[PDB]
Structures are given as structure tokens and as C-alpha cells.
Amino acid sequence: GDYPAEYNPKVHGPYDPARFYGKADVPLGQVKLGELSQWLGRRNKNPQAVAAAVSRGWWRWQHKYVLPRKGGIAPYIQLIVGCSIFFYAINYGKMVAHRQRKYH
């Protein structure tokens, strides 16, 4: 538990957990799908790397829906539906065992 070693306060400035502090990689949005295999293989799949990628995404979502001053109830409704959707797919085996239509 520490600040990432790629972070430099002299060039970047103060730390911001929603900004990637490594080498500036081209994001997947502008990949023309001919470099998709190269882009996926280049990005490592360490447990450390994906955990940092989750936190950098989570703080991006905090920066868009909570950290602004006038943060409404919309993030806290999005989380509830997001968790309900995710947990319905987990409990799909118990839910689909009952169903309503015999043929459908």
C-alpha cells in the first residue's frame, strides 16, 4: 500500500488516482481493431496490474459522479442497479430453476 513508483510529482504534479502514471499508451478506443491482438497482448495481466486498473477506473467514475460539488443521487442509484444486475446473473441458476412459462 503506497503510491505507485511510476508516479513523478515533479512533472505530473499532485497525485490523482484516476490518471494512469505510467508510459502514455494509446487507449483501446482509437485502436482500429487491426492492432487489437497486439494491444491485448501488450497490456500485462498481473493481479497487480488489473487491481491498479480497477482502482484507476473506479476513481475515474468517482471523478465523474461523486467528486464534483453538486453530486446527486445518480451514482448511488447506478451502483444499486449495477450490483442488482451483477448479482442476478450470479443467482441465475436458482432463478431459472423456477421460471414462469413451461414452453416460452
Partner 1 sequence: LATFLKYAKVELTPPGPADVPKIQEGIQNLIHSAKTGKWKQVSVREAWLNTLIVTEIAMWFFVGECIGKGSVIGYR
Partner 2 sequence: PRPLRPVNPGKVRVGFVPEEWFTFFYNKTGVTGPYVLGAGALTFLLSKEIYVVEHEFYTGVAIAIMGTYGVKKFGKQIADYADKGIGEIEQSFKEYQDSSKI
Partner 3 sequence: RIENYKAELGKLGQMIPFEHMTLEDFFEAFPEKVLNPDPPSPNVKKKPFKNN
Whole-angstrom distance, CA of residue 64 vs CA of residue 58: 10
Residue 41's binding partner out of partner 3, ligand CDL, partner 1, none, with CB under 5 to 8 Å set by partner kind: none
Query: By CB under 8 A, is residue 40 in contact with partner 1?
Result: no
Residue 14's binding partner out of partner 3, ligand CDL, partner 1, none, with CB under 5 to 8 Å set by partner kind: partner 3
Interaction with ligand CDL in 24-63: which residues (CB under 6 A)? 27, 29, 57-58, 60-61
* Gyration radius of the chain's alpha carbons: 20
Q: In Å, what is the CA distance from 82 to each residue of 12, 20, 43, 77?
A: 33, 25, 27, 8
Query: By CB under 8 A, is residue 101 in contact with partner 2?
Result: yes
